[PDB]
Amino acid sequence: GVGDLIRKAVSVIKNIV
């Protein structure tokens, strides 16, 4: 769902650097 999409997005952002 959208909730998990945004949860995953935070994970991506935390690994992006």
Residues at the interface with K ion (CB under 5 A): 4, 7, 17
Q: Which does 13 bind (CB under 5 to 8 A by kind): a second copy, K ion, none?
A: a second copy
Q: How far is CA 8 from CA 4, 14, 16, in A?
A: 6, 10, 12
- Of 6, 2, 1, nearest in space to 14 by CA: 6
Query: What x/- string results for residues 1 through 17 when contact with a second copy is judged by CB under 8 A?
Result: -x--xx--xx-xxx-xx
Minimal distance, residue 14 CB to a second copy, in Å: 8
Q: Around 10, how many Cα atoms within 13 Å sit in the side-chain half-sphere?
A: 5
Single-letter amino acid, residue 11: S
* Residues contributing to the site for a second copy (CB under 8 A): 2, 5-6, 9-10, 12-14, 16-17
